Design a protein around this ligand. Structure first.
Ligand SMILES: NC(=O)C1=CN([C@@H]2O[C@H](COP(=O)(O)OP(=O)(O)OC[C@H]3O[C@@H](n4cnc5c(N)ncnc54)[C@H](O)[C@@H]3O)[C@@H](O)[C@H]2O)C=CC1
Ligand SMILES: NC(=O)C1=CN([C@@H]2O[C@H](COP(=O)(O)OP(=O)(O)OC[C@H]3O[C@@H](n4cnc5c(N)ncnc54)[C@H](O)[C@@H]3O)[C@@H](O)[C@H]2O)C=CC1
Ligand SMILES: NC(=O)C1=CN([C@@H]2O[C@H](COP(=O)(O)OP(=O)(O)OC[C@H]3O[C@@H](n4cnc5c(N)ncnc54)[C@H](O)[C@@H]3O)[C@@H](O)[C@H]2O)C=CC1
Ligand SMILES: NC(=O)C1=CN([C@@H]2O[C@H](COP(=O)(O)OP(=O)(O)OC[C@H]3O[C@@H](n4cnc5c(N)ncnc54)[C@H](O)[C@@H]3O)[C@@H](O)[C@H]2O)C=CC1
Ligand SMILES: NC(=O)C1=CN([C@@H]2O[C@H](COP(=O)(O)OP(=O)(O)OC[C@H]3O[C@@H](n4cnc5c(N)ncnc54)[C@H](O)[C@@H]3O)[C@@H](O)[C@H]2O)C=CC1
Ligand SMILES: NC(=O)C1=CN([C@@H]2O[C@H](COP(=O)(O)OP(=O)(O)OC[C@H]3O[C@@H](n4cnc5c(N)ncnc54)[C@H](O)[C@@H]3O)[C@@H](O)[C@H]2O)C=CC1
Ligand SMILES: O=C(O)[C@H]1OC(=O)[C@H](O)[C@@H](O)[C@H]1O
Ligand SMILES: O=C(O)[C@H]1OC(=O)[C@H](O)[C@@H](O)[C@H]1O
Ligand SMILES: O=C(O)[C@H]1OC(=O)[C@H](O)[C@@H](O)[C@H]1O
Ligand SMILES: O=C(O)[C@H]1OC(=O)[C@H](O)[C@@H](O)[C@H]1O
Ligand SMILES: O=C(O)[C@H]1OC(=O)[C@H](O)[C@@H](O)[C@H]1O
Ligand SMILES: O=C(O)[C@H]1OC(=O)[C@H](O)[C@@H](O)[C@H]1O
Lengths: 265, 265, 265, 265, 265, 265
């Protein structure tokens, strides 16, 4: 398909998955991370750079026809680290894209943007943010920044609020939040194939019977996830303690992130 | 089941399909069009007449237990043609029905009633009209008139906003708008079998993954389309040039109709 | 405010009021009607013609900087008459405007576009039309046509759904529908001063305690009606017979129009 | 799932089904009814008593881990009888639950809480009640009371507005209201397994093509009905007389209950 | 105007006010209460009776052209008292009205029907009930019953959810809930004068700046309260201790009723 | 009232106004800014500190019972400066408050959080953000951060999206966006007096006839602005050129901010 697809955060959990899974989407896959990467194989380029380094980011993006942006701080951490990877880093990514043809972006946002909602409430894409920590707040920043770039310059971005992207559901919450590898891959393919995308909020979950999120307004994209966490309900009962009804795990959409304090360095 | 079903526009694309598919629905199928009709077979009656001719429309409707109204100007044309076929014609149709037992009507409205909406916007049945030309405006007229006859006299009509009712999806837009022959046929069956219909807006599309329209409020009818344009995405990608993101074809729900000028004779 | 303002339907009830009240809005007031006009005074031009005649409408509009479109059939009548003044006439008006610099239009639409709603239901501008006769259907046509010209060519129109524009309220329904001369004049002023108008639905009523309609989304125009029909309640109670609860007058927003039959020539 | 499950109304139509179908859900099934119960088998306890008698209800509930509350007056009857089983009985049940560890409750509410809505209107869980008789009003009382106990004490209840829970659909209305035994059993299972339930309104219907009700906001429970009344349409069409369009059966969601008078003792 | 107006609860706080204020509304005022009533003056009739006594309620209502129903248990009490006065009592009232020409009813419902909502949430008339006790639940019963009689028989009722109808606002909550005597009186006048009423929910509050409730949909009645609790903020600040932010008084719309236990005799 | 009120940005435009206007609200007014302040008068303390300096911010806040946070970058600027004053600075402010009793905060947010909405659209507090530059994005950051602190720790904040806080409206946009000094002062007083605030979005505008924003859901606060920009419409026509309809000034709620590029250092 496209000539060069950039995957940031390529040394991380989802990154290593996409390095393999997204290979067929582009002639060249460019992997990037602040961490060392397994050496480039055929049809790969590998880049080491800090998202906080504007010039390095510019060079990282130059020549790419698309970006799957997975790089950054992925859990609650002290402000200083989140500022670097998720705030400053987002600005640098969007400036870099703006300078190099505005390649379409799949932004790994997070359920933690809305982590304080009760699990009993079904959410559409326009609900007000209720971030469950500094991490969630920084993902909101990425979303607001992407939106401004879309309105101002036409830069297109899929704001994918990922639930739990794992090999399989492994706790009660994931019966709702699970986002299979296959379904995330198919979403990415649907996002790049669209003639027109805009800057939509996308709920990153598989077709789970217990899902909390409404993607119906994204119908124009033609993406229907195929996996269903519900198949794993018995597996969960036979491999974990039953949740305590007072556990954040079953009370808040962000689960135990709500229990995180403000971490300090 | 019913004694006599009138199909107008019977010489056109859809009319020819329905002349065949709807036969099982009535002892007699009365076919009508302004254009020459293939001669009547057994259990058929053929009438060639102009919808703008009130007396002719009266005789066309007399003795009919139902009407599938496909007849009229079907594309953007100069005002006078549309006035005759779609405005005067609709008034004549409704008066004729009113004088002859108010046979239930399936009205072929159009997506062009809402053609100026962006394709990214999901639409429910109550959205304000945004017609994309004189043709669209005239289909709005049909919907408004039918509603008035419903409220005033109890005349029942299904206002079917047809997307693209063709043998197969042919382009990117039809991945959203396609309305299979089978699904239109089952809709008509569902409309006529209903003890109570009212005057509902019905979105005329199959169960397409990329559909833009929400038919959920029509649930009482018990009609669920079974076809899905998504099955053709690959095929369309393989046999047609990728749309330009600036083409009305992938920007507006009415596709290229928004680009139509006002046509003059 | 402007060089020349066209007032159509200038011989009619509202026309005669606006001929006097709108004089200060332009250097020249052009008055037009199908019927004879009192002779042009200083600062006036008068033209007698039929909206159904394109050449005449073209001349009527040429050189005008704005149009207050009051001309047309104003009550339920046979379809033939409505077709001329309200359907053909509207097409002609919009084509003439399009050929002559797209002067901003105040369109006299009508409450009868929604006449079948119960009086107990409060309506915002986006409710589905429920016209109470051919007249109401024809005003819907005007709205649909104007919206199409706005979306296609940028022609701006205020779709004013007039309640009862009279010297004073004189029945129970008018405690809700009354639209004072002063408040209609001020709306017209606010419509023409606006740098940007669009094609908004506007509910044409004064600030009546018993009003049925919500103009809040029109706030950007900065128009606040100042009269209030409520002040006339006692007068009406003493001057008129109490309404029968089964009377259309107190059951439908369109009042007795719902009781109109289809009139024939 | 639990040590002891109480099933009230166990002698009635649904009671007899649940006595068999819910056995696997608990070590001990306690069956209760005003009327005589078939003798307790292994793993059963049986208690015959009136919900109107607090001491008896206290004993009935004590030691139970969950309650499926089917007991009460199930059709329109004189107020006196409804008062006992459905009003006084409900207060007693909730007080007994409050005194005995607040075992989770599945409440058999009813479609008759909203029986006066037209069949053409799709309903979400928050619609205002429109009860079609004293019976419907009494089920509303149950819902209101349960909600109060939830907000005040945390007592959790599933307010199941049952459509028509029968072996199969046997009339036109049931194509929309049918609630299969299997789907009710699976709902009960999903209600009791949930770590958190709250006090949700639940529409009690299978996955019928012609369904009137929207359970989407209940998604967090992970319950998806699997049966579909639509499969019985032909059978019903051939086995029963076509409904008269003026019949309450096809006009109101409560069907013929709207035609019930107020019955007197 | 009307021949005879029944006021129940006439011995209570509000009843005493209305015995005086409503006199001008009818030739005869029939006052009723279970408690001793001051003896009847000219143009008065006094009846001392229990609402739970069906025969008594029948005679109380017979010959009355309207009813202001203030009678019943007015605070949280044990179930039996509320059952008699507010549940059995309401059934009796509605049956009595049904047997005697369906005199229009002003029903004193209560804010306690929705007492568990946060004070920060603005409420429209269709919000789901959240009663804060047995008293609240019983007022819900009244609303549900009245609605059923409306739908089934056409009996009209104003369901007035009274906030705090007192001579003046006394505390912080009353800055939002206050309903002046004058405004309640004008509401009642507006209710009875209306040709068509229906069975509307009415929020019983004056035009308070800090009001929580939206009466806009009641516009057709033409009732606009004129008093405003805000005028008393200073005074309340000056003469009462500032509320603790944790007090139900400033946390829940039902104020301290949420803190009520279930009272036993 | 309170002992010590902090006003940040006290050397700026609004700061100098509030230094004077808010004096009566507290025994001690503490003014802070990165810029030099006019020396402390009686009942004033003056502090010089960079919002980016965590320790200085801690000391700035310690001992204050309330904060009006006006300090930060107030217009579109390069990222580096906005990062310091509006992002890092916001984190430091919220940490400082959290360490010192969580004094209630009035946050100067901005209309520029929603600057890309058309002026024709009326906005409620829950609309999705559409920031019109880096500045707007940073105000969104402050809002999301404040919300997280509220959900996590109970920190209360008024998120005041200020329109144009000036001595008087001085262009066409300000007929909609004007926020008088008096009305901002009264809002601040209303915010601090509330027993319960939460973390509400507040639209910072006076009671302008041409206002675009809906504060109705904030009714519980009891704040009604008293000034009206509409009084200044003639003043505006007589002191400025009429707006060009294509000017951002009359097309976007953020006015010419939409025209700002990304500024670089
Ligand atoms: N795993 C899940 O199910 C969910 C993941 N997400 C997110 O999607 C993405 C991938 O998540 P994971 O793979 O699980 O996290 P990870 O922590 O396994 O991947 C993150 C990568 O980004 C890199 N990175 C961090 N700071 C950087 C910087 N300043 N410059 C350059 N690279 C930097 C890391 O070295 C790393 O390999 C993240 O942005 C994350 O927030 C959101 C919701 C759920
Ligand atoms: N095929 C599609 O995808 C869509 C179809 N529709 C519509 O449903 C109907 C059928 O569509 P098509 O078969 O594709 O169009 P067609 O142009 O192939 O069928 C229309 C027929 O009506 C006849 N007709 C035109 N003016 C007449 C008059 N004054 N009096 C009597 N008959 C007259 C024509 O001769 C013709 O055969 C139309 O009313 C049309 O607007 C609306 C949206 C999409
Ligand atoms: N008066 C009211 O309260 C309300 C008025 N309206 C409307 O606003 C307008 C003015 O209403 P009125 O003054 O009461 O009606 P009118 O019947 O007193 O004024 C209408 C005028 O248009 C003229 N006209 C009719 N057909 C024409 C044609 N084919 N070509 C050129 N002129 C033609 C008539 O000769 C006439 O003087 C109308 O469009 C009407 O429908 C809508 C709602 C309420
Ligand atoms: N069967 C259906 O499709 C629907 C059923 N429901 C309801 O679910 C429940 C079961 O319905 P069915 O089995 O069809 O009714 P049923 O009339 O066959 O079962 C009700 C049982 O409760 C008992 N009962 C009545 N008053 C009592 C009292 N004062 N104390 C103790 N027990 C008392 C009866 O003796 C009886 O066996 C009821 O609450 C009913 O209202 C609601 C909607 C539809
Ligand atoms: N005053 C307020 O702010 C609010 C008042 N309301 C209500 O409006 C009405 C009047 O309220 P108040 O005057 O403050 O209460 P009240 O307790 O001063 O008036 C109620 C009257 O009904 C009578 N009553 C009680 N049980 C009866 C029975 N079984 N049969 C016949 N009469 C019976 C009482 O003796 C009494 O005088 C009530 O129905 C009440 O619930 C609701 C919300 C607020
Ligand atoms: N003036 C208006 O009508 C509107 C104002 N606002 C806002 O409300 C506030 C006040 O606005 P103005 O008075 O007009 O702006 P200003 O630019 O006149 O006031 C801002 C002050 O904050 C200070 N500041 C900047 N960076 C700082 C830092 N790193 N550490 C400590 N102090 C720093 C400045 O030195 C300055 O005096 C701002 O936060 C602004 O964004 C929002 C919408 C409209
Ligand atoms: O909610 C989750 O499952 C996850 O969401 C997050 O955004 C994380 O990156 C991740 O590791 C998880 O904690
Ligand atoms: O959207 C469509 O495919 C169609 O719209 C219309 O309503 C037509 O009848 C048709 O021929 C098409 O161009
Ligand atoms: O509703 C009304 O009062 C009026 O509305 C209409 O549109 C008319 O033009 C008029 O004369 C009235 O009948
Ligand atoms: O609506 C139904 O089919 C049923 O609903 C009811 O609530 C009954 O219990 C029942 O027997 C039926 O009449
Ligand atoms: O909220 C109120 O002020 C009242 O609520 C109620 O409905 C009462 O009748 C009353 O006495 C109050 O406590
Ligand atoms: O929109 C405005 O008027 C203002 O809004 C802003 O947020 C600014 O601080 C200010 O100076 C203005 O440009």
């Amino acid at each position: 398909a496209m000539k060069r697809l950039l995957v940031t955060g390529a040394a991380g959990q989802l990154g290593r998955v996409m390095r393999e899974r997204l290979a067929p989407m582009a002639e060249i896959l460019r992997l990037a991370d602040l961490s060392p990467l397994d050496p480039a194989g055929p049809n790969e380029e590998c880049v080491q750079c800090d998202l906080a380094d504007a010039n390095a980011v510019n060079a990282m993006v130059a020549g790419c026809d698309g970006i799957v942006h997975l790089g950054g701080i992925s859990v609650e951490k002290p402000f200083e680290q989140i500022l670097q990877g998720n705030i400053i880093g987002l600005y640098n990514l969007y400036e870099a894209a703006r300078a190099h043809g505005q390649p379409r972006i799949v932004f790994a946002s997070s359920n933690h943007t809305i982590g304080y909602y009760p699990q009993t409430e079904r959410l559409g894409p326009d609900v007000p943010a209720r971030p469950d920590g500094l991490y969630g707040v920084s993902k909101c920043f990425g979303e607001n920044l992407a939106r401004m770039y879309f309105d101002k310059f036409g830069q297109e971005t899929a704001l994918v609020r990922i639930g739990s992207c794992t090999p399989e559901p492994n706790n009660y919450r994931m019966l709702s939040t699970w986002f299979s590898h296959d379904d995330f891959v198919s979403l990415i393919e649907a996002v790049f194939r669209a003639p027109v995308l805009g800057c939509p909020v996308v709920w990153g979950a598989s077709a789970n019977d217990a899902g909390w999120w409404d993607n119906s307004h994204l119908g124009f994209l033609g993406w229907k996830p195929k996996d269903n966490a519900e198949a794993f309900r018995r597996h969960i009962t036979e491999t974990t303690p039953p949740p305590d009804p007072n556990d954040a795990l079953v009370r808040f959409q962000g689960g135990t992130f709500v229990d995180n304090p403000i971490f300090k360095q």
